[PDB]
Write a protein that binds this ligand. Structure first.
Ligand SMILES: Nc1ncnc2n[nH]cc12
Length: 259
């Protein structure tokens, strides 16, 4: 019934997220704190559509004044971001497990017609068993409803992760952006650096990639199998881009790596 607020979790633009601990049951939860006067509805009513074990569980919302209280899953292992050591990344079996559950979640969401629009290691939280959870549907929206897709036109996300067509086109399909950002997480995961600042013609590193100069700083660190899969994801024409069911068929993905 009453929730002690133990320590901060992430001081976001919205306000802050805090660890919260139940005085009787000792169960720990996280309370994102939206002071509307210093959008938050859609994020709430999206949260009521969600129920999966690779997505932050949503509990309820105390409506005190304008200080909206978002009662969400505690992820005690924090951010996939803090398990990528710079310029090296992590062990290739650890990458695969995390990319498996990224795919479990994106499939699950895409299944119900919602797109996250901001997949990046900062938005993948890990529980006590390092089990990955997709977090913060603040920029997430409906793109399929009554089994009719709606095209996106609003630009958003985080540049280095964002898909090329979110910058050259006026309308674009929600799922291939999501296919593109998860591959930038694959690449972070395996190299420990991001390939380019933004997927642009004006950007040297993305020009190289499209020219297939794969003897250059992040790709050289990536094994031929996962790099074969990244050549399929980070395709510039989102119509030829590998779709999630094809990702599920790929050689690397189905390779036995971890006990
Ligand atoms: N930043 C955060 N740290 C831990 N658990 C969380 N859940 N939702 C956001 C979180």
């Amino acid at each position: 019934e009453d929730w002690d607020l133990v320590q901060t979790l992430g001081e976001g633009a919205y306000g802050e997220v805090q660890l919260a601990v139940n005085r009787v049951t000792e169960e720990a939860v996280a309370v994102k704190i939206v002071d509307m006067k210093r959008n938050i509805k859609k994020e709430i009513c999206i949260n009521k559509m969600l129920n999966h074990e690779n997505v932050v569980k949503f509990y309820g919302h105390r409506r005190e004044g304008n200080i909206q209280y978002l009662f969400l899953e505690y992820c005690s292992g924090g951010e996939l971001f803090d398990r990528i050591e710079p310029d090296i990344g992590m062990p290739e079996p650890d990458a695969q497990r995390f990319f498996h559950q990224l795919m479990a979640g994106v499939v699950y969401l895409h299944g119900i017609g919602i797109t996250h629009r901001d997949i990046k290691p900062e938005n993948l939280l890990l529980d006590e068993r390092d089990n990955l959870k997709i977090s913060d549907f603040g920029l997430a929206t409906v793109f399929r409803y009554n089994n009719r897709e709606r095209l996106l036109n609003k630009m958003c996300g985080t540049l280095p992760y964002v898909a090329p067509e979110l910058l050259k086109r006026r309308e674009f399909h929600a799922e291939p952006v999501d296919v593109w950002s998860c591959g930038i997480v694959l690449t972070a995961m395996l190299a420990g650096e991001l390939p380019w600042d933004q997927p642009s013609d004006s950007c040297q590193e993305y020009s190289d990639w499209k020219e297939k100069k794969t003897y250059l700083n992040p790709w050289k660190k990536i094994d031929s199998a996962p790099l074969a899969l990244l050549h399929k994801i980070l395709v510039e024409n989102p119509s030829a881009r590998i779709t999630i069911p094809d990702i599920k068929k790929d050689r690397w993905y189905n390779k036995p790596l971890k006990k």
